[PDB]
Amino acid sequence: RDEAGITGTWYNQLGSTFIVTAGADGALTGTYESAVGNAESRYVLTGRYDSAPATDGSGTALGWTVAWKNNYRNAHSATTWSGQYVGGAQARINTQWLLTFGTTEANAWASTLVGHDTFTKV
């Protein structure tokens, strides 16, 4: 239902770029490029979305993951975003995210950052 609405290039408030294709079957595949952190260039992402969302004005739930390893750098971390796609003139993906770093067991208390990203098509 939102396959066409989701597919494409999105940008967040940090200036990061998310390029995604939504599959008819609920798949999300693409690339992510972060404007911040221990990252450079594009990184693979994968995820899932609700391909048959409610028809009552609700958003479409979705999520995706990036492991922060590519040919340039390995940040020994992974971020997951969970959120919803809200269609309309000013389409948005509103997300919250969890960034986990690989740690030793003694530091595991301090292993996960939490934040929020809002993506637009502009």
Place this chain on the structure above:
Amino acid sequence: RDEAGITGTWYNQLGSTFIVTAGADGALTGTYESAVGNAESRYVLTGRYDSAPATDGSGTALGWTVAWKNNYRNAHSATTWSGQYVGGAQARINTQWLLTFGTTEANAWASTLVGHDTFTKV
């Protein structure tokens, strides 16, 4: 590096079952079956992991997503887990998760649950 350690069947403290294959390239693919919530049977999951983790005793960062739609039910929601794989006699995936429900804009404040799951091989 942890491709063999991750691949297989894992169980969390709720009695949910995660069946995953880790790809050499950082992919995670599989199925999830929740012991709780608006769910039945298996659901597709996808995700990513750090395929070249630090060699200093750190865990391996990873994450994955499930959209809660399959042939039996559609919960109009998606969960992402972010965490790390810790190998050894008692291997564990320690995760935190974010479950987003599709909502209207007025209810979007209340759209995301947060929790934590710990997965073992037993």
Place this chain on the structure above:
Amino acid sequence: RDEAGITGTWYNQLGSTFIVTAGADGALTGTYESAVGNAESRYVLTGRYDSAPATDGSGTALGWTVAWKNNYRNAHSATTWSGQYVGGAQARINTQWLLTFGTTEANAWASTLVGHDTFTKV
């Protein structure tokens, strides 16, 4: 240091109102009135802030809690906000929050909502 900057009336993006006094000693006391949810009128809040923050342009860490019981209603829940005060012409408190509901042990997986609020003086 930010005692005067914090003290006063703040409003978030939902239209909620936070009225706080910051003590020289790091205390926060006041009242919260939510524009949404199972709430009416004002509720007690308490919290803490860093009364000697870094002088390098960093924000001032702070947090506070509301238990959602007052003389009108009891929502059997509590929210904590964690964030930072950023002073300047357009002062802001940027927060993330965790709302826990009282649950049975079987439902405890689904006991905590996560979100984010941004408070301004206007």
Place this chain on the structure above:
Amino acid sequence: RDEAGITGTWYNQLGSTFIVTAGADGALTGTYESAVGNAESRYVLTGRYDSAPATDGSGTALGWTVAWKNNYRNAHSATTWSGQYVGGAQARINTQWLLTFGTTEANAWASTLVGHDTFTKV
């Protein structure tokens, strides 16, 4: 209702110590000593709890904050815990927490850690 159950000394899985008094009116006051992180000795805490919880076996919602400044150290951070008290032979406070560090605006994306603590009386 749980004023007597909450009041006292609690310990988490890291070996941290939380000493709290619960007031009839919903207040929590006390001290926290962390076994980990940029902390030493005791730090003031304050918080709130549901003083009239549901009678159907549900837990009692509660939260509290610590700003990580005392006479020994100032970590320019604050943690909030949100959770519930579950009474009975093996009483527990099950919490999730948000730790915010003071940051510059450029680093604010990376300002908040998320975790979970479970407190017992032993």
